[PDB]
Write a protein that binds this DNA or RNA. Structure first.
Lengths: 76, 56, 130, 256, 158, 167
RNA sequence: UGUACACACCGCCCGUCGCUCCUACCGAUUGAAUAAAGAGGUGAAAUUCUAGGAUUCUGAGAA
RNA sequence: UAUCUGGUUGAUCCUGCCAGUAUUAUAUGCUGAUGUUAAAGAUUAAGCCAUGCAUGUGUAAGUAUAAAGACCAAGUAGGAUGAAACUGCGGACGGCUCAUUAUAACAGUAAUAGUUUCUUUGGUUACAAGGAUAGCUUUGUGAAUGAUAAAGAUAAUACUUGAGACAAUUCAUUCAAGUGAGUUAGGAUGCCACGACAAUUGUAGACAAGUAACCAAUGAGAAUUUCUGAUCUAUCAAUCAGUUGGUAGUAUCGAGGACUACCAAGAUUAUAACGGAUAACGAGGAAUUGGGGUUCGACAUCGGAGAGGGAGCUUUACAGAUGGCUACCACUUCUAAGGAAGGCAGCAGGCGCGUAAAUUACCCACUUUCGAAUUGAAGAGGUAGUGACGACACAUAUUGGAGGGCAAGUCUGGUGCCAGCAGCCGCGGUAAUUCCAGCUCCAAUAGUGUAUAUUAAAGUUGCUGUGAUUAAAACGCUCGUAGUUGAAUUAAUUACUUUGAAUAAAAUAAGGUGUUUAAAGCAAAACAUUAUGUUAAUGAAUAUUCAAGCAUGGGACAAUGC
């Protein structure tokens, strides 16, 4: 999507009864400015919270770090 | 007896009556179980111009 | 899955394995509101329409006096015991009665052939004091 | 909830009022004004409970509608006027002056004052902005708007007010060597000397303060209220003098 | 919950309704102290169980814990002033060694029989109920009144 | 009435959104007023909290600012020639923000005569053509459906070329 | 040694058919009843805009 | 109290279930001396309502020649007081119910540099003008509503004009300092619209009082929004087309596909989307528990939603208001037959429904709310009446049972596999320990049985914690993705751990305190023989607290490092 990316956060949820964690994930739609041109899929991204910029886009990309490739270099 | 509150704002003196057995108003009197001691709370409305003014 | 991060399968296994509990599944699935003549109610009221006597099981001998009741809330037809000695003569016809359970035994209980309900009032007070 | 709420149930009232849970179904909601709903003590609460001049809400009205109570230098006739911090409370018919101060038990306590020291008040600046026409003004914790102030009067300091004239008498900088009395969370009523002020870029400033007896604790910058400079106070502290006895002493002293 | 006041229980019924070992043991306490019914035995057991639970909780903590020092001293002080625990035993471990007889021997009915004001433990109950016995300054008609050590020598006829 | 709540939409997953409450005044919208070109016609609308919004149904005049000369003049609006959102706004001469309109540069010409002593009928070439042709290009910068007026500015070098090529 | 018998092989036990009662399944009947979504037809009403100016106010204007 | 017992057998050891047991909470049978405290039409029907009340408000300070002022009292601008009426404020708070609702709501948390009223509080900016209107008088209609028509007058802090001299909005350009961060508060230039501080009130309680805009507080308020967190179900596996994003605009108090035009094909899903069920409002909390847990939460308090069903609006600062209005559907009532209002999921009460739930009472004296205000109202609130729902203390009698589980009779009369008892095993075929009675004693006791359900027992749902050769249960076998688990080894985040910050009470635990004890209450006093004084007396530090979020010391065990 144009000037927008989807960021996935992986965290662990603690279930009190079994005293064990379980893996969970949530998708956050964030706005990617054209300043970050080398941003592709799989990169590590730090986002910050701003005013609602769309129906779901309520965050903004502040910095990003490139990571390993998977023969699919899908840039922004 | 017991404690004194000097209350010129309401033009009043109030005491906790401790019975060891128009300006006067008595309220909240109850004895102790088994007779004997009786307690209560008294209302010194001094001048008869507060009593009427400051009295339901 | 006894691991530290294996809480998904451990929690999901108990959900599936709990449905094999006969006593627990019965109280959760939708049958107490359709297949129970009494329903959730502890006691129910109905009209007596027929006086019946059921023979007991093989190792016993005698006739179990009982009544046939038409409940108000649903309209089903049931059979109800008449507790202690000679209490069937106290029960009239086309009158309201209070019907209230039994223990539950092996489901059925004490008038033997499939009866599971006992008359506790006759309009009056009690098919006890009466 | 179509509009503002006008009632206040007793159980929802702020805890440090200590309204008896069986006294009634309602609590006196403090009318808007200088101080917040939970940082204030309504005038009815002060007279009826803390001073026993009145025995019910009927008699509180007779006292206050007689024009006999002065908050600050002005005279208030509102039975639910919000009296919060060291805002002075003067009763000229009884010739006594109190100051609504905190104490170590997270409570509002009336500190007696002399007539000459009931003519002044300490206010904590909250913000300093440029008004229209490049006219600067300061907003105090009381809620006063003050016109052209001294340029050194920054956001987090404290000033001394002359109640009869409204002028500024003395100001104390918010530095790392000045006394402060906490007004917020668990430090409510505690008095110490600021020793460290660490800042986080995003969320809050957290202040480390050392008690007079050597104890140390921490609080948010919001709850800090500078009392004086160089361990010297401009106001008379309550009986405990801002010292929290650590539990065992308080329990033992209540037994005795 | 629906009432703003508070209501609490004071006794609990036993788990196994019918035992011969329990029936005679309770009867020994009833005869020795002249109790109305087994509800008065059960209140003592409940009251004893609460203090036993408190002492058992803090005995598992460290000796110098501030929580233990505050609650342990308070529990012992309440025990001493009630007269249940003699003043020499100032350790929490002695609370666990308490028995229902210690608490029962501090009811006003027991003391006025031991003090000689009444001929029999049953006569003590009748004397108490008839507004005939005074403790210090206030008359008492409840025989379950647990007298403190300070009020112990203040028992006299009306 | 028209509503602006998000309870009638669908979730980001495409699932339908069930209903718990009814419509409320907080999320109330109002019927748009398409400010056409014609005789002056404005209405006062009571908004929330008692404030008043000037709903301009029809307008002819407007105040336009020349950035280079640092002046602002009142001027009659002639035509609407470009709307970047809908072409139907061009035919109906609807006045909205960002609508490139054509106005007669009569007051601006007169001001130039009194200030420089010259007549326009360096400046960008297309600006001169608008002066001699009697129709200069300006962009509306106010919200006529809210403020009740047409406030704008005369287009200049880089903005003029982009909008002129669009026509 | 084997056992499914312990009244102990005169043991125990299987299935079809006939009778009575109960529960549930398929079943032609464009079966029936109730309730809620979807589409479409007709569509009161109040608001927004537009035309109207009965009246009444100043000596054409305003409402 | 970290507890088990009867029942498969000729007898034994097991798996395993049935029954017994205790506790809660709902109904009911029998029974009942007191005092304190206390739930009470939710379950079924958010079904229907007769009647009565539940929202009004006046001080010296808005307007009063009432033909009102023998009632204080006198009266040339209206003497104190003043009914009704215009004007102002309020009825958007409070009260009731839980139908709707499955990331919706709610809880903690964070943001508003993305909005913001009302009230209250602190500040800032002509020697006096114009009409008409009610109560008033007069004439009236209609069966009738809180029904209404004409004419004649009369006031304003009602409606207007008008000197007294800036402020705030939009736009364009520009100079720029706090804050983590702002072309930001702010200043300058030009322009439009808007435009004031009553043309106001007490002679008496200059002091007041009132009014318009604009700043700021109240406001950790309201409203949107961020992160994390829900019950069962795969005989629900694919769902979505304003749907996902972009630009421009529109609307709104405001962000925003909230809506429109054009553009692109996106968004969610095995870590359970989209569906379906709920006899589902969420939370604080409640019952029971050795530890872990299981079940419940309509109902004190906080948040949400609704007023028979939808829908649409008016007034106003706040309503999609219903003790406001309009229309449609379903009802109810009056009627003179023409027409008319009404919404008890408000307090009493009535019908129906069901196993299941109270007076058509009195008062604003307590708490507090509203109002022109010390005074008036308040079915909010308080007091009283019914009340074996429950809890506490306390007199001297009932309830169930007597084969075992389980304490108690191998007593006597009838009954004769009948009547019956029997929760389970079972007893009864004429000598019944079990039926029906009489006597006796067994348990509890003003309580005690029964029925349904929750919890424990159940190590018969298992994380602590089960079983799989034969009792039920290892896929026919191998490959395999997600998932789970991963050898030793080194002298930037996350996770983990320790301290805190901040965080509503009630409730739980717990500190003090002789309500005569106790359940309670948060007060009372201990002694000062107490006004004096302890005293400026107590408020338990009251601690919690899980899952998230913030800070801090440590880096062993772990994940992503790069």
């Amino acid at each position: 999507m144009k000037r927008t990316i989807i960021v996935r956060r992986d965290y662990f949820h603690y279930v009190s009864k079994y005293q064990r964690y379980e893996k969970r994930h949530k998708n956050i739609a964030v706005h990617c400015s054209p300043a970050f041109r080398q941003l592709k899929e799989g990169d590590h991204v730090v986002i910050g919270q701003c005013r609602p910029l769309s129906k779901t886009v309520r965050f903004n990309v502040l910095k990003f770090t490139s990571r390993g490739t998977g023969d699919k270099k899908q840039f922004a | 007896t017991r404690n004194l509150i000097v209350n010129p704002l309401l033009c009043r003196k109030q005491v906790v009556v401790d019975i060891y057995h128009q300006t006067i108003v008595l309220n909240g009197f109850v004895t102790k179980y088994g007779g004997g001691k009786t307690s209560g709370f008294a209302l010194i409305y001094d001048t008869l111009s507060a009593l009427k003014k400051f009295v339901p | 899955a006894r691991g530290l991060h294996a809480a998904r399968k451990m929690l999901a296994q108990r959900r599936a394995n709990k449905w094999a509990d006969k006593e627990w599944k019965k109280g959760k699935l939708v049958t107490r509101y359709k297949c129970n003549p009494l329903g959730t109610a502890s006691h129910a009221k109905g009209l007596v329409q027929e006086k019946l006597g059921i023979e007991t099981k093989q190792p016993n001998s005698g006739i179990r006096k009982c009544v046939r009741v038409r409940l108000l809330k649903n309209g089903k037809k049931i059979t109800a015991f008449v507790p202690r000695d000679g209490s069937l003569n106290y029960v009239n016809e086309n009158d309201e009665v209070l019907i209230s359970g039994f223990g539950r035994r092996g489901h059925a209980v004490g008038d033997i052939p499939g009866v599971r309900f006992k008359v506790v009032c006759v309009a009056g007070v009690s098919l006890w004091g009466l | 909830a179509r509009g503002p709420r006008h009632h206040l149930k007793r159980l929802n009232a702020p805890h440090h009022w200590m309204l008896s849970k069986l006294g009634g179904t309602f609590a006196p909601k403090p009318s808007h004004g200088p101080h917040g709903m939970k940082e204030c003590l309504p005038l009815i609460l002060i007279l009826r409970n803390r001073l026993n001049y009145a025995l019910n809400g009927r008699e509180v009205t007779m006292i206050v509608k007689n024009r006999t109570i002065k908050i600050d230098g002005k005279i208030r006739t509102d039975t639910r006027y919000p009296v919060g911090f060291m805002d002075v409370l003067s009763i000229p018919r009884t010739k006594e002056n109190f100051r609504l101060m905190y104490n170590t038990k997270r409570r509002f306590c009336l500190v007696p004052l002399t007539a000459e020291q009931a003519k002044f008040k300490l206010c904590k600046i909250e913000k300093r902005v440029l008004g229209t026409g490049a006219i600067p003004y300061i907003v105090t914790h009381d809620g006063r708007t003050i016109r052209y102030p001294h340029p050194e009067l920054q956001a987090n300091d404290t000033i001394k007010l002359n109640l009869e004239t409204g002028k500024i008498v003395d100001f104390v900088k918010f530095d790392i060597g000045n006394t402060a009395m906490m007004i917020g969370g668990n430090g409510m009523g505690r008095v110490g000397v600021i020793v460290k002020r660490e800042v986080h870029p995003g969320s809050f400033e957290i202040v480390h303060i050392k008690d007079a007896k050597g104890n140390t604790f921490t609080t948010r910058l919001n709850n800090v209220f500078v009392i004086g400079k160089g361990t010297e106070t401009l106001v008379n502290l309550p009986l405990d003098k801002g010292i929290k006895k650590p539990l065992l002493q308080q329990v033992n002293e209540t037994i005795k | 919950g629906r009432c703003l006041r508070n209501h609490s229980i004071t006794y609990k019924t036993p788990k196994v309704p019918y035992e011969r070992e329990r029936f005679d043991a309770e009867l020994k306490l009833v005869g020795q102290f002249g109790l109305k019914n087994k509800k008065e035995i059960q209140r003592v057991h409940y009251m004893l169980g609460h203090m036993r639970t408190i002492a058992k909780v803090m005995l598992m903590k460290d000796a110098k814990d501030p929580k233990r020092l505050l609650e342990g001293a308070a529990l012992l002080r309440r025990l001493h002033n009630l007269g249940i625990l003699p003043r020499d035993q100032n350790k929490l471990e002695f609370v666990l060694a308490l028995k229902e007889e210690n608490l029962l021997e501090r009811r006003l009915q027991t003391l006025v029989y031991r003090k000689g004001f009444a001929k029999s433990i049953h006569h003590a109950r009748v004397l108490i109920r008839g507004k005939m016995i005074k403790v210090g300054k206030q008359v008492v008609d409840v025989p379950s009144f647990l007298v403190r050590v300070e009020s112990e020598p203040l028992i006299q006829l009306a | 009435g028209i509503t602006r709540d998000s309870r009638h939409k669908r979730r980001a997953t495409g699932g339908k959104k069930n209903s718990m409450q009814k419509k409320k005044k907080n999320t109330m919208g109002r019927q748009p007023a398409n400010t056409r070109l014609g005789a002056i016609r404005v209405h006062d609308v009571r908004c929330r909290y008692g404030i008043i919004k000037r709903r301009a149904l029809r307008l002819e005049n407007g105040n336009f600012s020349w950035a280079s000369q640092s002046i602002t003049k009142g001027t009659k609006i002639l035509n609407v020639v470009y709307n970047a959102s809908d072409n139907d706004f061009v035919r109906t001469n609807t006045l909205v923000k960002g609508a490139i309109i054509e106005i007669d540069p009569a007051p601006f010409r007169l001001w130039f005569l009194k200030f420089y002593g010259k007549d326009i009928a360096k400046f960008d070439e297309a600006l001169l053509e608008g002066f001699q042709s009697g129709r200069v290009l300006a962009c509306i910068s106010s919200r006529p459906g809210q403020t009740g007026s047409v406030e704008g500015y005369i287009l200049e070098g880089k903005e003029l070329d982009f909008y002129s090529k669009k026509i």
